[PDB]
DNA sequence: ACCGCTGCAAGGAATAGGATACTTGCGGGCTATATGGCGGCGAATACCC
DNA sequence: GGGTATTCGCCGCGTACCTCTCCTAGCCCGCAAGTATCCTATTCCTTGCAGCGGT
RNA sequence: GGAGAGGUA
């Protein structure tokens, strides 16, 4: 499910976006061809051509709840589309140095360790789940290639992905390439720097941090000893992003939660390191970097099967309700775990701790908001993660990615200015073992709610299960939108025309930095070849009642580059469906026919009942002295048509005497071919 | 329901097709009995008796030129179009008269 | 809308229907004219039409 | 009087709201394509002698 | 070139009243009306530079 | 004001 639901929004260039409307045939001078259906803004119904099938694409704005219907000659899609041209304009410093180096430099190759590799495996003291074992299989088998890696590591909460990173952390000081990740936060740094040195407590590897824990000294020691590359593994916060680390060899980068840095700073950190083979998680991406993840231009991968008894953590969409506090706090303290309660009010927390200290006289209750000293908050982080007490009243810096798997219920007491993903992320602090998680969510009065997080908490609550990371991924876009595909605003629409578009603008800024072709030259419309012999040929609906599959096949005939594509085409026609229709099997030749002619030059072919004309390629195979021998024999039958073109006069009555002709015709040409 | 005909394609193509459902002009209806209504003023319309589209031979029972002669002519008359004449000219001619 | 509602507004042959009688309706909706485009004047013919 | 450390401002992310100039339907207020009627009569042509 | 002759365009073609409906097409110009987007708030995360004890 | 339509004598 990726392409052809009915009524889902769907994209042409020259008009804009409308909504699928089914498939038909209309007769239009004899040809009753194959044409689809759109449906813009007061009704205007477009019906397409069959061949102009690649004028379409999926929406790629999400925007289900409401895109824009363009109408029919509004301009709104052009004027998008020259401003987009504008901002893909290969005088775009953001972009085309990395082009550049792509056209003049190279990465590194990573080598594989058949051996110690073992020994850390060995030194991994759990079993991998199946789904994790592939992500490190792709990870380390990128790492081992010789191009600037860039992977997405897009998995469930606390399945272990700290263990693929440092996976691939040891393949690249194996080859001491002083790896550099980057978290967006010091609290979840410093748990990382602790699972770094738990881990790996045997080898002779340096990993530190830099990082607002490590002082205007210490830090500074730290840089320096990143400066003399001496340090393995570094962790770091934004601190990286300040144009002061400097790695005498960074070979290997790995971004954690890229969804909180901003690609501002994400393209920061690339533009320092050519060849660095970067690598990216998180749990849920942003909707502008989901589908420039699914689309595939970087890698992806998700993470399933939990590795011993991750479950389905209880979403309760509540209202504001003292004794629902009462209820999950005691629940909680007799099953044993920790309580969290987010506030994200610092200028009211010290009283919210205040009244839920007196609120529930059981609980041992502590403040965390990131507006007081790092210590005194290190001091908090320290007593909440030795279990020295159960509830927290805290602001949303839990949402730090903190892991603590023995808290089991979350309470959010006010849960309306805060984005799914981030709700996601929240949910993911309750749970990570085999004790049950709650999740509490305290709302006010639904009038007095939000307009938005209405449509938020009934996708929290309908959305639980094994799974639901993309899920809910898939939710965020088209309820938040893709962004500029560049710039910054990566929550909006942002003029979304589709990444399928920076495709062929990457490809004309390609022919502009090729020297010798402008931007001027943007090859916006290449059909490339084209042949005309003027039947009807279809899919016939009654041979065919699936639109689905009859585009599809029609996507089979595009794609078909050689003569066995269009034999299995025709087996696997025949095996499933039977018959073999008249139009059918006419436009198969034809495709076979389009195939001749990119083999054999030809750039246009027009035909008709009497004729038609042809035109050549430079460079071609077309025998010059045979053509002429045809004309100077059948004079009758030929004229020249300029340098390049042919009118040949041929009595084409029967369709099957137009198939022969041009059949055996081509087969004239491919015989003495020059 | 409006065509593009690609241009460069010969005689007999099509690039693209669009068609929508355009409002267009004002048609009175009738009414149970056959009374229109115009502006609360109902009217009717009578119907006409006007002269088949044809061909029709007609004279001059000696009543023109002066001579007892009878003038043979005949029309082609169209329903939509111009009128095809056909007289005798008192010299025995044959004269066709174009509306 | 011009040529559909000057020809049922303002003609020779639609014309206002007399309405005093359940009879002069009938009639007035079964009339048969010779006037009107397509038709000769009311003044300029002869005896024999 | 010289220096390492705290804390209080300075600048990115994520979210509400009002503004504000774009974008446009409209309505008033202007300029600019024939074919069913005859009798007579005098003036303009047609015509050969 | 002169009588005749034919055409041909213009002239005309009842009086008085009563009832009803209907009176330029289209174009332009700005003028009200509705909108997406940008400056203004708020209140997490790292920076940066000055207070600042302390000697 | 002028067109059109129908009607009486």
């Not at chain 3, 004219?33 to 003044?43: H, I, N, V, Y």
């Amino acid at each position: 499910l990726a392409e052809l639901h009915i009524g889902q929004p769907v994209v042409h260039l020259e008009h804009g976006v409308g909504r699928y409307a089914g498939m038909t045939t209309l007769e239009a001078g004899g040809i009753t061809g194959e044409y689809l259906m759109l449906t813009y803004a007061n009704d205007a119904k477009l019906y397409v051509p069959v061949s102009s099938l690649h004028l379409i694409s999926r929406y790629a704005g999400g925007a289900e709840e409401n895109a824009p219907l363009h109408k029919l000659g509004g301009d709104a899609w052009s004027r998008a589309r020259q401003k987009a041209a504008e901002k893909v304009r290969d005088v775009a410093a953001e972009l085309l140095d990395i082009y550049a180096q792509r056209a003049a430099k190279e990465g590194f190759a990573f080598k594989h360790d058949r051996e110690q590799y073992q020994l850390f495996c060995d030194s991994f003291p759990f079993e991998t789940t199946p789904d994790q074992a592939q992500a490190i299989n792709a990870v380390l088998s990128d790492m081992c290639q010789p191009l600037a890696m860039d992977r997405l590591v897009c998995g469930d909460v606390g399945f272990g992905k700290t263990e693929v990173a440092m996976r691939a952390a040891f393949l690249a000081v194996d080859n001491h390439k002083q790896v550099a990740v980057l978290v967006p936060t010091t609290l979840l740094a410093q748990q990382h720097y602790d699972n770094f040195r738990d881990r790996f407590a045997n080898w002779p590897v340096r990993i530190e941090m830099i990082s607002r824990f490590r002082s205007a000294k210490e830090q500074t020691q730290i840089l320096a000893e990143v400066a003399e590359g001496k340090i393995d593994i570094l962790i770091g916060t934004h601190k990286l992003l300040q144009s002061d680390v400097k790695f005498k060899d960074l070979g290997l980068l790995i971004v954690d939660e890229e969804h909180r840095f901003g690609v501002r700073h994400k393209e920061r950190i690339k533009a320092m390191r050519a060849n660095v083979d970067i690598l990216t998680l998180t749990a849920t991406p942003i909707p502008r970097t989901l589908n420039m993840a699914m689309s595939g231009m970087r890698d992806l991968s998700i993470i399933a099967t939990p590795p011993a008894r991750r479950l389905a953590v209880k979403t309760f969409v509540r209202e504001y309700d003292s004794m629902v506090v009462r209820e999950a706090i005691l629940r909680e303290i007799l099953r044993g775990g920790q309580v969290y309660y987010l506030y994200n009010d610092v200028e009211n927390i010290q009283k919210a701790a205040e009244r839920l200290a007196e609120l529930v006289p059981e609980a041992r209750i502590a403040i965390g908001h990131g507006q007081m000293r790092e210590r005194e908050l290190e001091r908090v982080m320290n007593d909440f993660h030795h279990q020295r007490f159960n509830v927290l009243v805290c602001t949303t810096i839990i949402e730090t990615g903190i892991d603590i798997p023995t808290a089991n219920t979350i309470i959010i007491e006010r849960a309306d200015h805060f984005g799914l993903a981030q709700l996601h992320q929240l949910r993911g602090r309750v749970g990570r073992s085999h004790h049950q998680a709650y999740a509490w969510l305290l709302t006010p009065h639904p009038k007095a709610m939000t307009t938005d997080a209405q449509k938020r908490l009934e996708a929290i609550a309908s959305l639980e299960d094994l799974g639901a990371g993309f899920a809910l991924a898939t939710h965020d876009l088209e309820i938040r939108g893709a962004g500029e595909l560049l710039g910054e605003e990566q929550s909006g629409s942002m003029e979304t025309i589709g990444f399928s578009l920076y495709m062929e603008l990457l490809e004309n800024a390609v022919d502009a930095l090729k020297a010798g072709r402008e931007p001027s030259l943007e090859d916006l419309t290449s059909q490339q070849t084209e042949v005309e012999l003027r039947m009807p040929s279809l899919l016939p609906d009654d041979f065919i009642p699936d639109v689905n599959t009859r585009l599809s096949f029609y996507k089979r005939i595009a794609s078909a580059k050689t003569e066995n594509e269009l034999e299995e085409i025709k087996v696997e026609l025949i095996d499933r469906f039977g018959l073999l229709p008249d139009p059918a099997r006419t436009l198969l030749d034809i495709a076979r026919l389009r195939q001749q002619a990119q083999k054999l030059g030809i750039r246009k072919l027009e035909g008709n009942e009497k004729g038609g004309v042809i035109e050549f390629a430079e460079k071609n195979h077309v025998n010059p002295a045979w053509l002429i021998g045809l004309l100077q024999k059948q004079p009758q039958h030929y004229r020249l048509d300029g340098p390049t073109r042919l009118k040949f006069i041929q009595d084409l009555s029967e369709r099957k005497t137009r198939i022969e002709w041009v059949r055996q015709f081509m087969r004239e040409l491919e015989e003495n071919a020059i | 329901r409006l065509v593009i005909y690609e241009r460069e394609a010969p005689e007999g193509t099509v690039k693209d097709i669009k068609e929508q459902e355009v409002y267009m002009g004002e048609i009175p209806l009738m009414t149970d009995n056959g009374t229109f209504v115009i502006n609360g003023t109902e009217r009717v319309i009578v119907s006409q008796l006007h002269r088949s589209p044809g061909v029709f031979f007609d004279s001059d029972k000696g009543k023109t030129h002066s001579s007892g002669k009878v003038l043979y002519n005949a029309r082609i008359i169209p329903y939509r179009g111009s009128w095809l004449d056909f007289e005798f000219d008192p010299k025995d001619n044959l004269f066709v008269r174009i509306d | 809308s011009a040529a559909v509602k000057e020809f049922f507004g303002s003609s020779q042959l639609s014309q206002f229907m007399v309405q005093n009688n359940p009879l002069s309706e009938i009639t007035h909706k079964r009339r048969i004219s010779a006037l009107g485009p397509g038709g000769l004047t009311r003044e300029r013919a002869g005896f024999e039409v």
